């Protein structure tokens, strides 16, 4: 209150069903995510950093792993 006028940024922790996949581009990170209520067509890969659900992420690679990288991790 009584400070800089708000007019930028407004991200909200929208409910996430589960990450569909994973793909990197340019150097960043983005995971496909199904959003509740919104039509499946409205798909949008959000940056991992922004994502506040590490548990879901692990859930995705958890199945693909046990072979993934074939090393540490």
């Amino acid at each position: 209150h009584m400070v800089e006028e708000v007019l930028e940024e407004e991200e909200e922790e929208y409910v996430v069903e589960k990450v569909l996949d994973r793909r990197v581009v340019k150097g960043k990170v983005e995971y496909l995510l199904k959003w509740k209520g919104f039509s499946d067509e409205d798909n949008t890969w959000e940056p991992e950093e922004n994502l506040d659900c590490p548990d879901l992420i692990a859930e995705f690679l958890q199945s693909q792993k046990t072979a993934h990288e074939t090393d540490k991790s």
Binding site: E11, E12, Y14, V16, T44, N50
Partner: peptide, 18 residues
Amino acid sequence: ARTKQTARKSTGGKAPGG
């Protein structure tokens, strides 16, 4: 009670409302 997983879809902008 535990918080359910959630991820910001970079909505931004502003709700249309009415």
